[PDB]
Design a protein around this ligand. Structure first.
Ligand code: K
Length: 263
């Protein structure tokens, strides 16, 4: 079937000129709403959630891991490094790198998480360990953002990412103090006010991770606490046909507003 909500998302998509993917899980009743839910999209910086979560999982068996220093050298800086550049020729802890990656979208910080995990495939391995058969991380920053149409590298589907985000933030994929830390980090994101959360009633609270890349790729994944009811998980991915396209955070806000109005 095609619901009214799905038809509205298709109208939004048509007007946008791009390709929109949406997955909602309403934890009040476990129901899902999806739009292109099984199509692949480039994750861009939304993949930082999986990497940070994989390090949190490692920390369950190493109480001091998050306080472990990692050297930041000039050669490690990539294209967007607002926290790591302050620490070149010094160190950041794995907690500091996780916070920087998640809350500031620091790409050097992501590369240090990836390295801690043994490379992109270590991120994918953690995904598989928590039941996500779809996610794949193939490259480091910045090349994981090339976002070329039809390229499977560094992609997932909206359905898979919503399910994973639920398990990580609300379920039991992580230990309870690690889950709480992930949620704290997401709720302190600095980059999200124009994306999903722009489409939601302002009384609601949320944590999110944005992403952006080539092909005007504009993404957000969020855990949401609406006023008065059980939490939601919402994924909104968007990508466009030309390599140089502009970001469209407003499309993500519009998708979220359609979802919220449909509850
Ligand atoms: K970024």
């Amino acid at each position: 079937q095609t619901s009214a909500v799905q038809q509205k998302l298709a109208a939004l998509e048509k007007s946008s000129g791009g390709r929109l993917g949406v997955a909602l899980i309403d934890t009040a009743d476990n129901t899902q709403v999806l739009y292109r839910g099984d199509e692949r999209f480039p994750m861009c910086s939304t993949s930082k959630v999986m990497a940070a979560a994989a390090v949190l999982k490692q920390s369950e068996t190493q109480k001091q891991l998050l306080n472990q220093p990692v050297e930041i050298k000039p050669a490690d800086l990539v294209n967007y490094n607002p926290i790591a550049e302050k620490h070149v020729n010094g160190t950041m802890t794995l907690a500091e790198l996780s916070a920087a990656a998640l809350q500031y979208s620091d790409n050097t910080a992501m590369n240090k998480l990836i390295a801690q995990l043994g490379g992109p495939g270590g991120v994918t391995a953690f995904a598989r360990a928590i039941g996500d058969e779809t996610f794949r991380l193939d490259r480091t920053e910045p090349t994981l953002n090339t976002a070329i149409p039809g390229d499977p590298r560094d992609t997932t589907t909206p359905r898979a990412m919503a399910q994973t985000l639920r398990q990580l933030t609300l379920g039991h994929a992580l230990g309870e103090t690690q889950r709480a830390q992930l949620v704290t980090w997401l709720k302190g994101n600095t980059t999200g006010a124009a994306s999903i959360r722009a489409g939601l009633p302002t009384s609601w609270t949320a944590g999110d991770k944005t992403g952006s890349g080539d092909y005007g790729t504009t993404n957000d994944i969020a855990v949401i606490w609406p006023q008065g009811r059980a939490p939601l998980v919402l994924v909104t991915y968007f990508t466009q046909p030309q390599q140089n396209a502009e970001s469209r955070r407003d499309v993500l806000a519009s998708a979220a507003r359609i979802i919220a109005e449909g509850l």
